């Protein structure tokens, strides 16, 4: 029984970054040779587990964190990095194991006029602990003055939209991501 | 109640065909507890016999993981969740296969939970549960296993026929 990587790497629609999905994989015979040796994945680079010897070790549980982020912005899905994603949406530990593929998807995600369904947090108070999503969208007051929970001056809705279009550049096209974690 | 017997021999945790083994066994004429559903301790192993399930664990609470076996009319389900059941959180391993005098031996060694059923108890199945197990309850005769040396007479097709304490 080969566990379903095809249900994570071929899902019809991916989940925006601020509420990144997750799937637990256990009790399967998983092959990473099919994953590594494909020319589609425009990124594959990982840590403490070299890609050649992936399938010759077995762990207790393997996780899969999937989302969709800006093309340029994908450099922050890595330990030790800091920015918007790594500091407010998806933060990795320092001793990370498992690894991260990211293939362009502009033919699938973006549509003419815009695709607003992918959102990302923009304002917060404190940096995220690793592997800690938050969904609450209480208005962020930009200063000491409160605003009684209304979008206005010095108070903003913390979720703003990517809005892809196919005519954008590679620096702004949508790059689906998957982040395998190992026991 | 109390009773005595002559049985409790299973294949010595090893699947060789063919002998003397120093394993966890049940003394031949030992004190076995005739029952007519308390929470009995597990010790190192139990002999179970009756003429439809089991719950194993340490605290049998949500603080620790607990083993649960249930036999349907068509199917057996083995799950190890943090049972209270009232609430199921975590839920790690789940085993589903055909349902199990009916006599059983349960031992939990090296993170594996081994089952033998039917003397010469053939191995039913072993499970990579990987939890501590100290006390148990029946969802019958209950004995306890002892680490003593045995002599087992194989009968030209395996089939342990006679045994010697």
């Amino acid at each position, epitope marked *: 029984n080969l566990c379903p990587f095809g249900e994570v790497f071929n899902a*019809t629609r991916f989940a925006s970054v601020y509420a990144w999905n*997750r799937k637990r994989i256990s009790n399967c015979v998983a092959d990473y040779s099919v994953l590594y040796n494909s020319a589609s994945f425009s990124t594959f680079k990982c840590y403490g587990v070299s890609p050649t010897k992936l399938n010759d070790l077995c762990f207790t549980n393997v996780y899969a964190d999937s989302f969709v982020i800006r093309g340029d912005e994908v450099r922050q899905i890595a330990p030790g990095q800091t920015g918007n994603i790594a500091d407010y949406n998806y933060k990795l530990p320092d001793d990370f194991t498992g690894c991260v593929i990211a293939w362009n998807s502009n033919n699938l995600d973006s549509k003419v006029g815009g695709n607003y369904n992918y959102l990302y947090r923009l304002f917060r108070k404190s940096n995220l602990k690793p592997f800690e999503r938050d969904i609450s969208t209480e208005i962020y007051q930009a200063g000491s003055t409160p605003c009684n929970g209304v979008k206005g001056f010095n108070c903003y809705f913390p979720l703003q939209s990517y*809005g892809f279009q196919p005519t954008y550049g590679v620096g702004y096209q949508p790059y689906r991501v998957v982040v395998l974690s190992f026991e | 109640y109390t009773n005595s017997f002559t049985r409790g021999v299973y294949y010595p945790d090893k699947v060789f065909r063919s002998h003397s083994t120093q394993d966890l066994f049940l003394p031949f004429f030992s004190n076995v507890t005739w029952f007519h559903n308390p929470v009995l301790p597990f010790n190192d192993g139990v002999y179970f016999a009756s003429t439809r399930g089991w719950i194993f664990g340490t605290t049998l609470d949500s603080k620790t993981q607990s083993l649960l076996i249930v036999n349907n009319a068509t199917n057996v389900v083995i799950k190890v969740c943090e049972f209270q059941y009232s609430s199921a959180n975590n839920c790690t391993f789940e085993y589903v296969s055909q349902p199990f005098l009916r006599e059983f031996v349960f031992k939990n060694i090296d993170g594996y939970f081994k089952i033998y059923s039917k003397s010469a108890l053939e191995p039913l199945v072993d499970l990579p549960i990987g939890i501590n197990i100290t006390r148990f309850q029946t969802l019958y005769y209950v004995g306890y296993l002892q680490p003593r040396t045995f002599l087992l007479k194989y009968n030209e097709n395996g089939t342990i026929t006679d045994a010697v304490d």
Partner: antibody
Framework: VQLVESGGGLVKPGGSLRLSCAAS????????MNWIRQAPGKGLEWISY????????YYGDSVKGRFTVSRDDAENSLYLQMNSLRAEDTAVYYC??????????????????????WGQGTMVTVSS | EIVMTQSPATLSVSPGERATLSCRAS??????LAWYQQRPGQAPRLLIY???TRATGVAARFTGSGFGTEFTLTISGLQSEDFAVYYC??????????FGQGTKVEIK
């Protein structure tokens, strides 16, 4: 956990009407919301959809240009705007809610979009 | 445009029996389907989402299964309340979501 709707009534062909439903008992600003509808004695049909804070509007095939949906998160309220009405869209409009996230027993942080707790009906009859 | 068809016309089962329902999709959605029970005169109610998970206020006598294109729902031990119409709707994309045509369970 309480969706109460209002604004339903009788309209003439070619008019307009504005339905609304107010919710209480949860954080309203974190959930998808969207409007189902049911013709009299037929199967349910899906009509609108709003996202997590505007800028996500979608619509059905037969109501593409006539219906405007918008939500005011702070008031725990929701509105649907109906323009250039016709006669064969008489129905009983509901305002559902989608389970945005379902964290299962282990991991499985899956994002669903099924219509959990609904409202009552608001009969909307269109005739001359 | 994923056309869903259920097509048991009118299920006719006596109380206390274990009945099954069918919802066949034209394409692959593979985990995205829901089951609704709509008692006559009431608003509908969610039973299954994800094709296997039960809702909050549902008894264990409702079970559903399927993957890809064939989905089923099984009701065991009917009571008087459980004679209604049943729908299935698919949501494995953004744009229009289609509701199944609905089947009714009667008393025999």
């Amino acid at each position: 956990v309480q969706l109460v709707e209002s604004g339903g009534g009788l309209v003439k062909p070619g008019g307009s009407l504005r339905l609304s439903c107010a919710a209480s008992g949860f954080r309203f600003s974190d959930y998808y919301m969207n409007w189902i509808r049911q013709a009299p004695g037929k199967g349910l049909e899906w009509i609108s959809y709003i996202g997590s804070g505007g800028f996500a509007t979608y619509y059905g095939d037969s109501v593409k240009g006539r219906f405007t949906v918008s939500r005011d998160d702070a008031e725990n309220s929701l509105y649907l705007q109906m323009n250039s009405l016709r006669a064969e869209d008489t129905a009983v409009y509901y305002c559902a809610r989608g389970v945005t996230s379902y964290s299962d027993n282990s991991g499985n942080y899956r994002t669903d979009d099924a219509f959990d707790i609904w409202g009552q009906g608001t009969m909307v009859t269109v005739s001359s | 445009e994923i056309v869903m068809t259920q097509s048991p016309a009118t299920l006719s089962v006596s109380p206390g029996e274990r009945a099954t329902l069918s919802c066949r999709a034209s394409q692959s959605v593979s985990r995205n389907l829901a089951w609704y029970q709509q008692r006559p005169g009431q608003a509908p109610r969610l039973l299954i989402y994800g094709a296997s998970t039960r809702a909050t206020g549902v008894a264990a006598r409702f079970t559903g299964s399927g993957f890809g294109t064939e989905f089923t729902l099984t009701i065991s031990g009917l009571q008087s309340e459980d004679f209604a119409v049943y729908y299935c709707q698919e949501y494995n994309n953004w744009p229009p979501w289609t509701f199944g045509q609905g089947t009714k369970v009667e008393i025999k």
